[PDB]
Amino acid sequence: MKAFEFLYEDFQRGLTVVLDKGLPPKFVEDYLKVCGDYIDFVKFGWGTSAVIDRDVVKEKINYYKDWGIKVYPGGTLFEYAYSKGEAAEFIAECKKLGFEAVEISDGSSDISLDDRKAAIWGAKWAGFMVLTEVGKQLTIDDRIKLINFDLDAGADYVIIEGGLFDKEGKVKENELDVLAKNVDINKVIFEAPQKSQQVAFILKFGSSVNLANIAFDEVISLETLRRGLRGDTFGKV
Amino acid sequence: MKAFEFLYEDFQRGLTVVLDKGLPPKFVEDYLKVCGDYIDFVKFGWGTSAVIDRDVVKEKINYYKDWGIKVYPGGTLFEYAYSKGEAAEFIAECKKLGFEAVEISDGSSDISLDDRKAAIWGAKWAGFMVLTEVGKQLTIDDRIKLINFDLDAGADYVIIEGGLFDKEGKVKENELDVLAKNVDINKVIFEAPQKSQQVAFILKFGSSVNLANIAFDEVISLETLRRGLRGDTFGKV
Amino acid sequence: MKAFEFLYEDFQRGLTVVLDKGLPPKFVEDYLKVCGDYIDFVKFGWGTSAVIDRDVVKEKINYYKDWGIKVYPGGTLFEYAYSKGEAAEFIAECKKLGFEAVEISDGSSDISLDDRKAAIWGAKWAGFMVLTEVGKQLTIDDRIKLINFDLDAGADYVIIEGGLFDKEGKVKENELDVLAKNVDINKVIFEAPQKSQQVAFILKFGSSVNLANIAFDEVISLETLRRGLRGDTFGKV
Amino acid sequence: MKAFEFLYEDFQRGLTVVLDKGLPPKFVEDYLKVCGDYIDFVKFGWGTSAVIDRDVVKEKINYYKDWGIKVYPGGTLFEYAYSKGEAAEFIAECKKLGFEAVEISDGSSDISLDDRKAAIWGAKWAGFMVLTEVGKQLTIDDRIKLINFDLDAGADYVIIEGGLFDKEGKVKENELDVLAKNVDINKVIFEAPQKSQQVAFILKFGSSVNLANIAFDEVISLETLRRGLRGDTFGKV
């Protein structure tokens, strides 16, 4: 039961992906009692999991699994291990630690479409859910090509690196409408670390939009924005 | 200790791959007491493992594992599951049954070089040892391209479909010499189901040659051929 | 439960008759755990049952009965006993040993149509299932006469001696089509000891065709051929 | 043992000084399990220790001491006590609380070079490790004079107030090269509260550079930047 339960009206809620930079284990155990209902995925940011103690990483993953959250290591660590030639050992250690998903990217390295598809099948047949990063010359048509290529290669979701906002910070609605006409947006996730970006995507697509790089203390804020309980979206959703 | 141990002279022994068509479980348990020292891999032929009871398949794999043998399902079962779109569930069931390797082939299907490389990484990152089948227009140079492509993609061994023998059954020694000049033959395995083929490869490359499709009752015959203890190779090795 | 159970598609399976030349008792007990689901009848070949120890013959028959298989002695032993004038003692000993069927033939003897029908009723009223052998001058029309005569006399199945293949080894499809127009092929069984014959009948009549003289180690091979899990019938059935 | 231990390559790591604004005691106890291996010193910021309960300050200092971290009160509290004439009582209370170092500064007060040297000896002979703050007219040569004066007076480290970055945010590399030619940079520490400054110093001097005013939640980020595990320093270190 929520406080003020009589104010609840039911709605379609999109995915939330949370960025964890290194939260303490028993802080995570208590933090999920407030907002574990509103998180779908957690990214351990970039290579941060390769810095932390191995029993601390396992203990944190068990706390997220008790709420049904899927945890994964950021794609920079895959690109690191891939550049060292260690990609099979990276995939094996992910399974021993207990991640349920992996992210494929070429943000710090160059990887061909042949190697990218091979890496996607590599991760699926190893038993992970697969996410990919798109956005790195790229017109909106070139993003549409890469998104469709990753979905046809078998990625479960595509993350748009965040492009979609102009020099002032207003959303480029023509490109965003062209994207929605050419791609199944139910399989797309947008990076929206700033509250103004979260408002712009919610006002464009409604409460069902999928969002990523959400800061751990803004999870409750985002749920109030989806539900119309903050002055930015009050009476608009 | 072997009978007549004083006749033993030590030598470099190549790989043996045995073909199992459906041997009974407690027949396999007793059979390995005679010749388990001389087997490296067992192929469960084509789709035969998809016909047998699941507890019988597990029981057989445990008997081969007690002698350190690596068991795998033949490449036609991969092509079947791949043609149905079930390739990830095929890899998952292989792990649950306890196979330690898989074979990638296109003997009945058509698969591109791009899909073939993606399937090889698929199997490697899932933690299997990977074998591939080559031979299906192909000159000796086209075999050499395909062998090097599968080895560069990361196959642990390449099996040559058996081409290498003429219309009478004599070995095409010029093509076989061109192969040995362009490929690391320590990673190549030759199909040799007939005793005359086993003799031709042993006389060309010595006891260290790797051989496949060996019938279960010819394993002891092959060890006598490698060791010079049968009239075909007597005094020639 | 079969291994890879998710690949199973349900189909109409025809009869399999297996030839036993003298398999050991506890080999049979273990062998049926692999392939007893895919056998309908076992022929003890020619006169081999008259050579073996009487308690060994009973012990083998009980192992086949535990899987619901019907065992019978080959028709050359009936022709032997009939030529000695001992046919009633042969029928009595079959019941004491525990065979559930008998085969009537004239492959080495000469027997009139009158005596043939009298022998068919002889075996039915004694309580056996009756099979007959046809093929010994005979055009396809003369086979069609003999098949209908044996079915009208009351035989449960007619076995075609295997005629149906040319001098190269290709099936004589014109005669085989004329047969299917004149005879109920659900009561016909074809001899097919070679894998090329098994493929030719499966491609002509589908998975539901009835086959005989199957070697004991080829039963799993035949089930993969019926199910399309081997390169000869892959994607054709 | 770290997660992904096989990716570790050994390297020279510089000092990290962390700013604590008032973290809760049992939050600090859990937080050090994640990143206590990557902290050398903790500054209790400005006068914040004089606002907190005396048993809470002791409890926090004991949690930092269990990881070998040296805690100190920020130099504004020394300047406060010095301006009141109470500097000897401030030194006495620091020993009773259990700080292991002190910071000498004139950031808000005016103090002569005579009084500054007397304060450095005051703190050393009382048994503390001594840090000083430099930067307040000053050319890079005048910074060099003050750094050498504090090191000759006996300071264990000198902190550069953070000058070294231009009006756009780019590092003034000409002055930074002149500094490194005149001063032992192993005894210098740079203030770098922003990630762009931390990157600029790591790219100029390598992973061995000493950094200060690191936010408590950015300690794991900084260790990934030193180790090349984040896109800013990926492949550059």
Numbering used by the authors:
A (entry chain 9), B (entry chain 6), C (entry chain w), D (entry chain 4): 1 to 136, 144 to 169, 177 to 251
The authors write:
Here, we develop a general method for designing self-assembling proteins that uses predicted structures of oligomeric proteins from thermophilic organisms as building blocks. Of the 359 identified thermophilic trimer homologs, 191 yielded high-confidence AF2 predictions [predicted aligned error (pAE) < 5, predicted local distance difference test (pLDDT) > 90]. We docked these predicted structures in the so-called “I3” architecture by aligning their threefold symmetry axes to the corresponding axes of icosahedral point group symmetry, using the Rosetta SymDofMover to sample the translational and rotational degrees of freedom along this shared axis [Fig. 1C, (27)]. To evaluate the accuracy of our design method at high resolution, we used single-particle cryoelectron microscopy (cryo-EM) to determine the structures of one nanoparticle from each of the successful PDB seeds.
